[PDB]
RNA sequence: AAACUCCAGUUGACACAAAAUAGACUACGAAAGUGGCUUUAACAUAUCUGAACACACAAUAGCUAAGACCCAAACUGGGAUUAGAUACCCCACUAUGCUUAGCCCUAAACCUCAACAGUUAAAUCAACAAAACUGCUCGCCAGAACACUACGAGCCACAGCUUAAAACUCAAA
């Protein structure tokens, strides 16, 4: 568990170093993508999202994922495939807003059940009209008496 | 008193303001200025500061040692050369 | 004579004047009503109450003032229709006064069974038999289950030992019906060691009977004081003139909480006695109200003086809230 | 040419220009991003105020001032007012770590102004005054 | 909400306050302590041990007097929150944190490891903490609670500190 945590941290550091250096790719270096999270199970990568530029960043990352995995294999050589997850805050909100723009709208007390208790009282009206606990360690045993008896 | 527009200054490249801001934020984070401001928002009592610094040093040492151990041991993470034995 | 508590401040906040409509939903003895009539004689006042004896006192005041004061017998829930038929359907009430608790004539009378000091039938019913089908506290204690009685004492009575007192009451009732107030007091006393009869002390730090809270709980549950009070507040707000003065007196924590949350528009389901830390934690969890309708005459509650406490110890816990409809 | 993130040095003649103006002459957009508010002011190279904006001036009040949208609106208003006076290119000088710290810049971009440099002037006391005690929450 | 509205932002001038990064260093000092710069003075002992009281120190808080006062801040006032008071939150502000000269002499003053010398061989060793020990010296302890108490004595201390009991009670702690 802690070993997997350290492995996740190492993967995060390696991916950040690959992102920062220009030797990996001029496109990736120009993007200046920053990673929010890296977690290994396959590997899930989560990068902070800035729409058009976000789509371009996602497309470039998807294109360069294979090269990134190949470069990671040079280092940690047995690296599982890396999955990039775009963190649009709550992605559900972004997708929902996109669909909503796309979509069509057409033309424009007391804390008790007082009633139940009242019913029960009316029903009633109608029908009318400690000790010592011995310690476990002090309990006697007569097995030895029986053994000595015969 | 110092000359201005030198410290913590990043030139925007081809109007890419977001990338320049990200670079500036990363520079400040690398220099620890952001964490410095966050810690300086409220007073951290000296005993608390010493405890936090000692814990951070121990955590960094442990993380480095664990990373070294994992890198050393992962050299054996290859296909089994003597399968069936 | 238990003088109306802080009646001077009630008069000040209401500020009675000639040709104004003032509704007293809790006429009772009428000391507040008498003081209001003393301040203004031409005021048109409504004296609503559930006790038939209170209605008789209101009719006596009507004998004193034939139409300046208008009597009304009924509960807060009925008060809406009663006033609608009375001739104040458009509302426009210039003032509203709402006391709470037990009337002095109610508490003194042992036949009503409102006090453990004097024996009597375990009635604890503000109604004096206008609706004989209305449950009495004796039927309540004899009928309700252990868990039901425990919940009633825990919520209404603010009782810590509901799980114990309810079981003791059930055990006693299984032997004999609980038909006497003093019998119930003895039963509750037996639920604890005898030394604990007067260990509990009032807010005045004066010894009181241990069963008192229990008695209080039953009274509320007999009269549905919380629900009927909420309905009365809603009906008053519906019938109160814009800019009218609403003055309320609350003798215990639950009714004061209800009144305050109604005035400030707070959700009734919100937790009680919230601290600032608890609010911050709640908002942090919720971080991933209705528009105000009142203007408080007094931001803070008004409490009786120490001398007034000595004169009327029963009114010590009274807290006064004054607001104006917006 | 090779782009260098380092700003051009005043007193040294650089080839970089904006609207025929040198970096030392580009107007300055001071942004203050507090936790409860965000203020934006454009000034000339000669410290002449040209436009000012804030969350409170844009109608937002109390907690609503702390939202990033309020800072974006303030940036839009400040950029419009500055552009009315002929401001085109600006040098952003941001201080504080408020929620609007970035949003204000976006507003300026949405306002029509061109940001050529981003500068951080967050007041960081080198062990200066003693800040208030930590909140007991 | 209150508060402020000569309030805020920019620029300039501007401290008897506090000493980012270095510091991922582990240094100095007897301990407490000490992390901006420079300069002066300066870090005892060529055998160890050696004091509740002698000699000299001793964080923070506190007292006395005179200054400074950005900021922080018990207390207090106000605003919220609360059924309500207080507290947690916000604002203003004081003692106080600072300087000078005295006093007080306390701490989870804790590496909870006395000082000095030696050993790593035996049995390594109740457990845990922090590998186990030996020689030597000083200090200290002898069931729990009563008790960081009472009395006595000493002290610049006067709601104080140091030393420190007994009776009744329990079979545990
Ligand atoms: N829901 C309700 N409807 C009508 N009257 C009610 C009521 N709940 C309580 N009351 C009445 O309100 C009064 C409370 S105490 C009476 C106090 C009175 N104002 C005085 O002169 O002191 C009692 O008369 C009680 O019976
Ligand atoms: K440091
Ligand atoms: Mg010596
Ligand atoms: Mg000292
Ligand atoms: Mg001061
Ligand atoms: Mg220490
Ligand atoms: Mg010694």
PDB file of N, CA, C and O (backbone and C1' of nucleotides) in Angstrom, chain D residues 30 32 39 41 47 49 62 95 126-133 135-137, chain E residues 1 8-11 15 17-20 70-74 88-91:
ATOM      1  N   UNK D  30      -2.514  46.834 -12.226  1.00  0.00           N
ATOM      2  CA  UNK D  30      -2.346  46.313 -10.880  1.00  0.00           C
ATOM      3  C   UNK D  30      -3.600  45.560 -10.466  1.00  0.00           C
ATOM      4  O   UNK D  30      -4.708  46.104 -10.517  1.00  0.00           O
ATOM      5  N   UNK D  32      -5.171  43.265  -7.267  1.00  0.00           N
ATOM      6  CA  UNK D  32      -5.089  42.821  -5.883  1.00  0.00           C
ATOM      7  C   UNK D  32      -6.198  41.809  -5.657  1.00  0.00           C
ATOM      8  O   UNK D  32      -7.377  42.129  -5.838  1.00  0.00           O
ATOM      9  N   UNK D  39      -9.494  43.889  -6.689  1.00  0.00           N
ATOM     10  CA  UNK D  39      -9.419  45.249  -7.197  1.00  0.00           C
ATOM     11  C   UNK D  39      -8.474  45.303  -8.383  1.00  0.00           C
ATOM     12  O   UNK D  39      -7.428  44.652  -8.382  1.00  0.00           O
ATOM     13  N   UNK D  41      -6.700  48.131 -11.205  1.00  0.00           N
ATOM     14  CA  UNK D  41      -6.469  49.524 -11.583  1.00  0.00           C
ATOM     15  C   UNK D  41      -5.414  49.576 -12.676  1.00  0.00           C
ATOM     16  O   UNK D  41      -4.325  49.024 -12.515  1.00  0.00           O
ATOM     17  N   UNK D  47       2.580  56.585 -13.821  1.00  0.00           N
ATOM     18  CA  UNK D  47       1.734  56.455 -12.635  1.00  0.00           C
ATOM     19  C   UNK D  47       0.525  57.386 -12.697  1.00  0.00           C
ATOM     20  O   UNK D  47       0.186  58.060 -11.723  1.00  0.00           O
ATOM     21  N   UNK D  49      -3.459  57.273 -13.095  1.00  0.00           N
ATOM     22  CA  UNK D  49      -4.595  56.338 -13.107  1.00  0.00           C
ATOM     23  C   UNK D  49      -5.483  56.570 -14.319  1.00  0.00           C
ATOM     24  O   UNK D  49      -5.889  57.698 -14.606  1.00  0.00           O
ATOM     25  N   UNK D  62     -20.814  41.554  -0.335  1.00  0.00           N
ATOM     26  CA  UNK D  62     -20.600  40.535   0.705  1.00  0.00           C
ATOM     27  C   UNK D  62     -19.966  39.305   0.047  1.00  0.00           C
ATOM     28  O   UNK D  62     -19.036  39.451  -0.761  1.00  0.00           O
ATOM     29  N   UNK D  95      -1.077  40.674  -7.113  1.00  0.00           N
ATOM     30  CA  UNK D  95      -0.682  40.390  -5.744  1.00  0.00           C
ATOM     31  C   UNK D  95      -1.861  39.761  -5.021  1.00  0.00           C
ATOM     32  O   UNK D  95      -3.018  39.963  -5.390  1.00  0.00           O
ATOM     33  N   UNK D 126       9.415  39.319   4.631  1.00  0.00           N
ATOM     34  CA  UNK D 126      10.602  38.630   5.122  1.00  0.00           C
ATOM     35  C   UNK D 126      10.599  38.829   6.630  1.00  0.00           C
ATOM     36  O   UNK D 126      11.161  39.788   7.161  1.00  0.00           O
ATOM     37  N   UNK D 127       9.905  37.918   7.314  1.00  0.00           N
ATOM     38  CA  UNK D 127       9.739  37.907   8.770  1.00  0.00           C
ATOM     39  C   UNK D 127       9.425  39.298   9.321  1.00  0.00           C
ATOM     40  O   UNK D 127      10.134  39.842  10.166  1.00  0.00           O
ATOM     41  N   UNK D 128       8.321  39.861   8.842  1.00  0.00           N
ATOM     42  CA  UNK D 128       7.917  41.189   9.260  1.00  0.00           C
ATOM     43  C   UNK D 128       6.986  41.193  10.452  1.00  0.00           C
ATOM     44  O   UNK D 128       7.351  40.720  11.532  1.00  0.00           O
ATOM     45  N   UNK D 129       5.782  41.728  10.273  1.00  0.00           N
ATOM     46  CA  UNK D 129       4.817  41.800  11.356  1.00  0.00           C
ATOM     47  C   UNK D 129       4.254  40.417  11.668  1.00  0.00           C
ATOM     48  O   UNK D 129       4.343  39.484  10.867  1.00  0.00           O
ATOM     49  N   UNK D 130       3.666  40.298  12.854  1.00  0.00           N
ATOM     50  CA  UNK D 130       3.136  39.023  13.317  1.00  0.00           C
ATOM     51  C   UNK D 130       1.693  38.870  12.862  1.00  0.00           C
ATOM     52  O   UNK D 130       0.849  39.692  13.240  1.00  0.00           O
ATOM     53  N   UNK D 131       1.365  37.853  12.074  1.00  0.00           N
ATOM     54  CA  UNK D 131      -0.020  37.678  11.634  1.00  0.00           C
ATOM     55  C   UNK D 131      -0.910  37.215  12.775  1.00  0.00           C
ATOM     56  O   UNK D 131      -0.447  36.798  13.836  1.00  0.00           O
ATOM     57  N   UNK D 132      -2.215  37.292  12.533  1.00  0.00           N
ATOM     58  CA  UNK D 132      -3.184  36.948  13.560  1.00  0.00           C
ATOM     59  C   UNK D 132      -3.143  35.454  13.859  1.00  0.00           C
ATOM     60  O   UNK D 132      -2.648  34.646  13.071  1.00  0.00           O
ATOM     61  N   UNK D 133      -3.670  35.094  15.025  1.00  0.00           N
ATOM     62  CA  UNK D 133      -3.646  33.705  15.459  1.00  0.00           C
ATOM     63  C   UNK D 133      -4.535  32.846  14.570  1.00  0.00           C
ATOM     64  O   UNK D 133      -5.472  33.332  13.934  1.00  0.00           O
ATOM     65  N   UNK D 135      -7.324  30.408  13.199  1.00  0.00           N
ATOM     66  CA  UNK D 135      -8.738  30.303  13.529  1.00  0.00           C
ATOM     67  C   UNK D 135      -9.023  28.975  14.215  1.00  0.00           C
ATOM     68  O   UNK D 135      -8.598  27.917  13.745  1.00  0.00           O
ATOM     69  N   UNK D 136      -9.749  29.034  15.331  1.00  0.00           N
ATOM     70  CA  UNK D 136     -10.115  27.836  16.084  1.00  0.00           C
ATOM     71  C   UNK D 136     -11.404  27.270  15.497  1.00  0.00           C
ATOM     72  O   UNK D 136     -12.479  27.322  16.096  1.00  0.00           O
ATOM     73  N   UNK D 137     -11.282  26.722  14.294  1.00  0.00           N
ATOM     74  CA  UNK D 137     -12.418  26.112  13.617  1.00  0.00           C
ATOM     75  C   UNK D 137     -12.019  24.787  12.976  1.00  0.00           C
ATOM     76  O   UNK D 137     -10.894  24.626  12.503  1.00  0.00           O
TER      77      UNK D 137
ATOM     78  P     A E   1     -24.753  42.803   5.939  1.00  0.00           P
ATOM     79  O5'   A E   1     -24.709  43.333   7.439  1.00  0.00           O
ATOM     80  C5'   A E   1     -25.868  43.297   8.256  1.00  0.00           C
ATOM     81  C4'   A E   1     -25.507  43.277   9.719  1.00  0.00           C
ATOM     82  C3'   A E   1     -24.686  44.454  10.217  1.00  0.00           C
ATOM     83  O3'   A E   1     -25.480  45.592  10.505  1.00  0.00           O
ATOM     84  C1'   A E   1     -23.725  42.442  10.990  1.00  0.00           C
ATOM     85  P     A E   8      -7.624  52.457   4.097  1.00  0.00           P
ATOM     86  O5'   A E   8      -7.647  51.806   2.645  1.00  0.00           O
ATOM     87  C5'   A E   8      -8.386  50.621   2.395  1.00  0.00           C
ATOM     88  C4'   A E   8      -8.715  50.475   0.933  1.00  0.00           C
ATOM     89  C3'   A E   8      -7.534  50.522  -0.019  1.00  0.00           C
ATOM     90  O3'   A E   8      -6.868  49.277  -0.111  1.00  0.00           O
ATOM     91  C1'   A E   8      -9.259  51.923  -0.827  1.00  0.00           C
ATOM     92  P     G E   9      -5.274  49.223  -0.287  1.00  0.00           P
ATOM     93  O5'   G E   9      -5.057  49.480  -1.840  1.00  0.00           O
ATOM     94  C5'   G E   9      -5.626  48.610  -2.803  1.00  0.00           C
ATOM     95  C4'   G E   9      -5.473  49.166  -4.191  1.00  0.00           C
ATOM     96  C3'   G E   9      -4.096  49.707  -4.529  1.00  0.00           C
ATOM     97  O3'   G E   9      -3.185  48.690  -4.899  1.00  0.00           O
ATOM     98  C1'   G E   9      -5.736  51.266  -5.192  1.00  0.00           C
ATOM     99  P     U E  10      -1.633  48.825  -4.515  1.00  0.00           P
ATOM    100  O5'   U E  10      -1.091  49.933  -5.520  1.00  0.00           O
ATOM    101  C5'   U E  10      -1.155  49.732  -6.920  1.00  0.00           C
ATOM    102  C4'   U E  10      -0.703  50.953  -7.675  1.00  0.00           C
ATOM    103  C3'   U E  10       0.606  51.570  -7.217  1.00  0.00           C
ATOM    104  O3'   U E  10       1.742  50.887  -7.711  1.00  0.00           O
ATOM    105  C1'   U E  10      -1.005  53.269  -7.524  1.00  0.00           C
ATOM    106  P     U E  11       3.050  50.740  -6.793  1.00  0.00           P
ATOM    107  O5'   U E  11       3.683  52.199  -6.796  1.00  0.00           O
ATOM    108  C5'   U E  11       4.084  52.812  -8.010  1.00  0.00           C
ATOM    109  C4'   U E  11       4.391  54.274  -7.819  1.00  0.00           C
ATOM    110  C3'   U E  11       5.365  54.613  -6.706  1.00  0.00           C
ATOM    111  O3'   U E  11       6.716  54.408  -7.070  1.00  0.00           O
ATOM    112  C1'   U E  11       3.511  56.072  -6.605  1.00  0.00           C
ATOM    113  P     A E  15      12.903  55.348   8.738  1.00  0.00           P
ATOM    114  O5'   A E  15      12.610  54.899  10.237  1.00  0.00           O
ATOM    115  C5'   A E  15      11.439  54.154  10.556  1.00  0.00           C
ATOM    116  C4'   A E  15      11.397  53.771  12.014  1.00  0.00           C
ATOM    117  C3'   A E  15      12.581  52.939  12.498  1.00  0.00           C
ATOM    118  O3'   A E  15      12.819  53.213  13.878  1.00  0.00           O
ATOM    119  C1'   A E  15      10.600  51.696  12.749  1.00  0.00           C
ATOM    120  P     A E  17      13.160  47.167  17.987  1.00  0.00           P
ATOM    121  O5'   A E  17      11.610  47.061  17.659  1.00  0.00           O
ATOM    122  C5'   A E  17      10.680  46.623  18.637  1.00  0.00           C
ATOM    123  C4'   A E  17       9.520  45.921  17.984  1.00  0.00           C
ATOM    124  C3'   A E  17       9.855  44.584  17.339  1.00  0.00           C
ATOM    125  O3'   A E  17       9.769  43.512  18.260  1.00  0.00           O
ATOM    126  C1'   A E  17       8.710  45.944  15.784  1.00  0.00           C
ATOM    127  P     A E  18      10.984  42.478  18.433  1.00  0.00           P
ATOM    128  O5'   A E  18      10.764  41.434  17.259  1.00  0.00           O
ATOM    129  C5'   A E  18       9.525  40.761  17.104  1.00  0.00           C
ATOM    130  C4'   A E  18       9.398  40.198  15.715  1.00  0.00           C
ATOM    131  C3'   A E  18      10.608  39.422  15.223  1.00  0.00           C
ATOM    132  O3'   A E  18      10.589  38.073  15.650  1.00  0.00           O
ATOM    133  C1'   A E  18       9.992  41.014  13.600  1.00  0.00           C
ATOM    134  P     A E  19      11.912  37.172  15.551  1.00  0.00           P
ATOM    135  O5'   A E  19      11.913  36.678  14.042  1.00  0.00           O
ATOM    136  C5'   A E  19      13.089  36.144  13.451  1.00  0.00           C
ATOM    137  C4'   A E  19      13.250  36.627  12.035  1.00  0.00           C
ATOM    138  C3'   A E  19      14.526  36.175  11.337  1.00  0.00           C
ATOM    139  O3'   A E  19      14.262  35.956   9.952  1.00  0.00           O
ATOM    140  C1'   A E  19      14.474  38.539  11.445  1.00  0.00           C
ATOM    141  P     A E  20      14.029  34.460   9.414  1.00  0.00           P
ATOM    142  O5'   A E  20      13.306  34.655   8.011  1.00  0.00           O
ATOM    143  C5'   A E  20      13.360  33.634   7.028  1.00  0.00           C
ATOM    144  C4'   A E  20      12.151  33.654   6.130  1.00  0.00           C
ATOM    145  C3'   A E  20      12.157  32.642   4.996  1.00  0.00           C
ATOM    146  O3'   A E  20      11.716  31.361   5.408  1.00  0.00           O
ATOM    147  C1'   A E  20      11.557  34.768   4.156  1.00  0.00           C
ATOM    148  P     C E  70       2.776  53.096  15.932  1.00  0.00           P
ATOM    149  O5'   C E  70       2.356  52.441  14.544  1.00  0.00           O
ATOM    150  C5'   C E  70       1.572  51.259  14.519  1.00  0.00           C
ATOM    151  C4'   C E  70       2.056  50.291  13.472  1.00  0.00           C
ATOM    152  C3'   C E  70       1.318  48.966  13.402  1.00  0.00           C
ATOM    153  O3'   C E  70       0.105  49.055  12.677  1.00  0.00           O
ATOM    154  C1'   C E  70       3.646  48.578  13.348  1.00  0.00           C
ATOM    155  P     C E  71      -1.240  48.406  13.264  1.00  0.00           P
ATOM    156  O5'   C E  71      -0.865  46.877  13.470  1.00  0.00           O
ATOM    157  C5'   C E  71      -0.628  46.035  12.354  1.00  0.00           C
ATOM    158  C4'   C E  71       0.035  44.750  12.773  1.00  0.00           C
ATOM    159  C3'   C E  71      -0.731  43.906  13.773  1.00  0.00           C
ATOM    160  O3'   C E  71      -1.750  43.131  13.171  1.00  0.00           O
ATOM    161  C1'   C E  71       1.508  44.096  14.470  1.00  0.00           C
ATOM    162  P     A E  72      -3.135  42.884  13.942  1.00  0.00           P
ATOM    163  O5'   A E  72      -2.793  41.713  14.959  1.00  0.00           O
ATOM    164  C5'   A E  72      -2.192  40.513  14.503  1.00  0.00           C
ATOM    165  C4'   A E  72      -1.529  39.774  15.633  1.00  0.00           C
ATOM    166  C3'   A E  72      -2.392  39.531  16.855  1.00  0.00           C
ATOM    167  O3'   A E  72      -3.253  38.419  16.706  1.00  0.00           O
ATOM    168  C1'   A E  72      -0.307  40.382  17.536  1.00  0.00           C
ATOM    169  P     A E  73      -4.767  38.498  17.230  1.00  0.00           P
ATOM    170  O5'   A E  73      -4.614  38.635  18.806  1.00  0.00           O
ATOM    171  C5'   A E  73      -3.940  37.639  19.557  1.00  0.00           C
ATOM    172  C4'   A E  73      -3.655  38.110  20.955  1.00  0.00           C
ATOM    173  C3'   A E  73      -4.864  38.547  21.756  1.00  0.00           C
ATOM    174  O3'   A E  73      -5.572  37.454  22.304  1.00  0.00           O
ATOM    175  C1'   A E  73      -3.154  40.151  21.986  1.00  0.00           C
ATOM    176  P     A E  74      -7.155  37.557  22.523  1.00  0.00           P
ATOM    177  O5'   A E  74      -7.284  38.167  23.983  1.00  0.00           O
ATOM    178  C5'   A E  74      -8.094  37.540  24.962  1.00  0.00           C
ATOM    179  C4'   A E  74      -7.260  36.925  26.055  1.00  0.00           C
ATOM    180  C3'   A E  74      -7.855  36.999  27.449  1.00  0.00           C
ATOM    181  O3'   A E  74      -8.818  35.992  27.698  1.00  0.00           O
ATOM    182  C1'   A E  74      -5.627  37.731  27.530  1.00  0.00           C
ATOM    183  P     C E  88     -13.908  32.881  21.924  1.00  0.00           P
ATOM    184  O5'   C E  88     -14.149  31.772  20.811  1.00  0.00           O
ATOM    185  C5'   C E  88     -13.320  30.623  20.743  1.00  0.00           C
ATOM    186  C4'   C E  88     -13.851  29.627  19.748  1.00  0.00           C
ATOM    187  C3'   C E  88     -14.075  30.155  18.343  1.00  0.00           C
ATOM    188  O3'   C E  88     -12.884  30.176  17.578  1.00  0.00           O
ATOM    189  C1'   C E  88     -15.966  28.915  19.038  1.00  0.00           C
ATOM    190  P     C E  89     -12.252  31.571  17.098  1.00  0.00           P
ATOM    191  O5'   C E  89     -13.351  32.169  16.117  1.00  0.00           O
ATOM    192  C5'   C E  89     -13.629  31.547  14.874  1.00  0.00           C
ATOM    193  C4'   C E  89     -14.587  32.365  14.049  1.00  0.00           C
ATOM    194  C3'   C E  89     -14.245  33.836  13.906  1.00  0.00           C
ATOM    195  O3'   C E  89     -13.262  34.079  12.917  1.00  0.00           O
ATOM    196  C1'   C E  89     -16.532  33.607  14.443  1.00  0.00           C
ATOM    197  P     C E  90     -12.269  35.331  13.061  1.00  0.00           P
ATOM    198  O5'   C E  90     -13.220  36.593  12.886  1.00  0.00           O
ATOM    199  C5'   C E  90     -13.802  36.888  11.628  1.00  0.00           C
ATOM    200  C4'   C E  90     -14.547  38.195  11.664  1.00  0.00           C
ATOM    201  C3'   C E  90     -13.789  39.369  12.254  1.00  0.00           C
ATOM    202  O3'   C E  90     -12.882  39.954  11.340  1.00  0.00           O
ATOM    203  C1'   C E  90     -15.966  39.304  13.159  1.00  0.00           C
ATOM    204  P     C E  91     -11.546  40.657  11.881  1.00  0.00           P
ATOM    205  O5'   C E  91     -12.074  42.001  12.547  1.00  0.00           O
ATOM    206  C5'   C E  91     -12.732  42.980  11.761  1.00  0.00           C
ATOM    207  C4'   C E  91     -13.339  44.063  12.614  1.00  0.00           C
ATOM    208  C3'   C E  91     -12.410  44.726  13.610  1.00  0.00           C
ATOM    209  O3'   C E  91     -11.563  45.690  13.013  1.00  0.00           O
ATOM    210  C1'   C E  91     -14.453  44.214  14.668  1.00  0.00           C
TER     211        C E  91
END
